[model samples]
Target: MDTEKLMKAGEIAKKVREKAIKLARPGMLLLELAESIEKMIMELGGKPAFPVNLSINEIAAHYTPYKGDTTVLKEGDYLKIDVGVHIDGFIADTAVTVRVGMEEDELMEAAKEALNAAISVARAGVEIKELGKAIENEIRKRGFKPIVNLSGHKIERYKLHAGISIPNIYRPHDNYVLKEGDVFAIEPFATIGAGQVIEVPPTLIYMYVRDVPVRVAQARFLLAKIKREYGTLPFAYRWLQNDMPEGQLKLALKTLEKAGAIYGYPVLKEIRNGIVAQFEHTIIVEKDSVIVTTE
Candidate 1:
């Protein structure tokens, strides 16, 4: 990877992140704000390195826009916004979490502490496992659990998931050594639920109906109607339950599901009334480490 090119891409990512955070607040639809970020990146002569990922509450990561899904932000919600930028094939990724309307200060505090801990131990020669250990200790001391499945990752140009992954909490099989020229983003996410996460099979998939069977044709028609306004992305019916014929939409989803065109992510849950929080930054593994992307 070209280090100089990587630095320039990182610079653009920093600006994009600042713009994203500015648009983040209560009363905004997470997907819409994310789409705006994508537009801004394109306007700046850089393409979105990946789909803008907006994971809310117990949903830790990788929840981007679905075909016609719209979930509005609400009070007492924890928002995690992650984005990546690709400028001339150099990639820079970053993420951060914020509490809406200033209600969950205790959860926010734990998130901030975990973020600081990750930043503190992210330097050249620091053991990779130390990042997880530090985050675990800090959040545990604060009486919260760091989501075990969601962890920070090494960033490389044109590679979204590259190099060592630093777990938010301790686990076996996470003992990589850190080295110079290895850039990483250490994100510690705290969940009100148990820190463990399992991948639920996807219930919807992206497909272009080639033969146009009657069923596929009808589904395609609906998909086109929605995609015309929402773009070519999958959406959740939970958000559209009131606006559309629930049974029709459910049938369309079922058709897609049976054809192996849909995937489902488990709706995560937490202990009653508990809140989740997250903090993240993209940093370089240097002799003296530095946060490349931060607000």
Candidate 2:
């Protein structure tokens, strides 16, 4: 791993955290915040590693805004602001959950404590399970449950979800040991409901297929063209349909399909009436310490 590349990713993450903090507020729509962040990233010569996800309470992950999503922030709502930055194939991601207009000191304290605990245990030569144990212990002590569905992961140059996964809960089977130069996103989330999570079947499929009966073949041709030129970072279907160069779409989709760069939407379900909190940081393990991305 190149330390220089990791340092660059860390710098990008600092900008992202600053923008995310400023973007959080009551009365602002989630998509508006996402748009603001997206613009800033582009202005800085970077692209969103993925869509800026503004997942709300009970919604664990990957729920971004639709064209007319009008949900506005309100008091007592738990907001998860997740952002990613990709520069020259290096990527960094982090998330924070904030309670809007509510002074729930207890909740904030528990979540912060859990975050710190995870950070404290992340360093070179440390057992990966230690991070999860720290998070679980801190949350359980505060009478909260750690969301078991989300696990932190090691990040590679261009791979979004790297090979190493550090879970947020205790599992005897998780045995990936940390090493120097290994970068991982350590996220510890607390929830008011059962910790177990189940994935919903994907309704949206972003893959391209060829060898279809006339009509299907035409559609695939168009989609393949688009995917080839622009890579698999979620393109706005709206933008593609209306504004793109008509001649480019089919080849783009074909390239994306040939490269196997399609992502199916994930299903995330939650217990009714339950709220959740998330804290995440990307870090590089060092000899005796770790460097947090947002720091």
Report the C-alpha lDDT of model 1 over 34-114, residue by residue, as the tens digit. Answer: 778878877877776666777677666656655456688887667777777766656677676766666547766787788
Q: Against the unseen true structure, what C-alpha lDDT does each candidate score? A: 0.67, 0.69
Model 2 worst lDDT run, 10 consecutive residues: 202-211
State, as a TM-score between 0 and 1, how close model 2 is to the true structure. Answer: 0.83
For model 2, residues 37-138, the per-residue Cα lDDT tens digits are: 777777777776666777777777666664456888887778777777777767778787777766545655666788788888788887888888888889
Per-candidate TM vs. native?
Answer: 0.73, 0.83
Relative to the true structure, candidate 1 has a C-alpha RMSD (angstroms) of: 5.9
Candidate 2: C-alpha lDDT: 0.69
After superposing candidate 1, which stretches have Cα over 4 Å from the reference?
171-173, 201-274, 291-295
